[PDB]
């Protein structure tokens with residue numbers, strides 16, 4: 025099957041957030057499932073520069089009143105379809121922000137044009153290649169299903185994935201007459217959102233199927249706490265809402281080969297793991313012993329529950345454990361953390377900033393990682409931890425609730441548990457989770473078993489991509 029992906033960004037060409045990571049990894053992974061994907065991305069200056077040997081394969085005479093060439097190029101396993109619309113994308117500034125740091129007043133027309141071109145490509149406008157379906161990503165591309173719906177030619181199936189529910193492509197209804205859409209399209213059934221225009225809302229309304237980055241997150245955005253005002257809409261289409269967990273690069277993240285850790289190991293052979301634990305303590309300048317070593321590797325914010333992690337350090341230390349923290353954020357949280365490091369000198373080590381190699385070493389040498397998030401559409405940290413044999417201790421929120429098998433009586437009895445989850449997401453819940461982890465740690469037969477199992481979890485992109493394929497094939501009937 026041939027799929028047309030649609031996004032305003034893609035790794036490694038352009039990136040402002042995790043959006044590009046998924047859009048850049050899925051297509052490659054999907055090749056393993058027999059799915060050819062061509063990704064339509066804007067001809068950003070940085071895009072045309074990066075790529076090699078581009079081929080003009082089409083020209084749109086009128087794209088909301090603008091000329092555009094369509095270059096097709098293969099870039100590092102990525103089969104791309106670049107949209108060269110100098111009037112929209114030749115700006116020299118972020119893809120969305122001006123040289124001044126703010127949104128282009130043009131944004132609405134810039135991505136509407138990107139969606140419209142995609143809609144036409146989906147309509148068979150390109151001789152030689154026609155998609156069986158389209159997969160749009162986020163608000164920049166959510167208008168693709170809208171233009172297909174209102175186009176004369178019947179729509180082909182569309183899937184819209186929400187990565188960023190907080191960015192809804194909301195604009196004044198005063199741009200409506202410049203969108204090349206029928207008047208009735210400005211309605212409930214269409215793109216009107218409280219007398220304003222909302223692109224995301226439009227696509228949520230028109231797409232054949234909707235998705236996001238975890239089953240649990242798909243449940244959450246149906247509630248007011250996560251829907252960002254869109255829960256009413258999505259809820260009316262819940263019967264076509266899907267949640268699919270993100271994968272990771274399990275070739276790069278493989279403890280058996282990772283070059284950014286002290287010593288390599290595998291589920292089959294863990295002895296070597298302890299050498300990484302030593303190195304982690306040495307690096308953080310803390311005691312090096314056989315006691316539980318917890319880590320945190322995250323942005324220090326209320327969103328990530330690090331407010332709860334600060335009131336929970338004493339509980340760790342009090343239990344005989346250690347804690348090492350790598351991450352940056354809320355200066356009040358940094359401080360309270362830094363302060364914990366002095367009050368519990370030798371037992372708690374904090375490191376503020378960014379450090380990817382250390383991040384690989386911490387996954388390889390710490391015993392457990394605390395991820396007390398209140399918000400986590402999917403999450404990567406717990407997936408790396410499983411892979412690496414670091415037991416995740418996570419809040420039951422979004423992706424975290426979907427990817428860890430909690431060590432409850434039943435799971436331990438069938439030896440199916442891979443980690444510790446807690447809910448609700450409170451300090452009490454957190455201290456409880458922690459205590460449990462330490463109790464588990466002091467039962468080595470149980471602990472190592474949890475590790476070996478977590479380490480055999482398929483957290484690869486291919487696995488994730490296989491779930492998209494099933495859906496694709498299902499949408500394509």
Ligand SMILES: Nc1ncnc2c1ncn2[C@@H]1O[C@H](COP(=O)(O)OP(=O)(O)O)[C@@H](O)[C@H]1O
Nearest residue numbers: 321322323350351352377378379380383404405
């Ligand atoms: N302080 C840090 N140093 C190094 N890597 C980090 C740090 N904080 C997060 N990471 C890693 O960077 C990526 C982005 O995580 P952030 O935590 O930045 O993203 P998310 O939105 O997933 O929480 C993840 O792969 C995470 O493991």
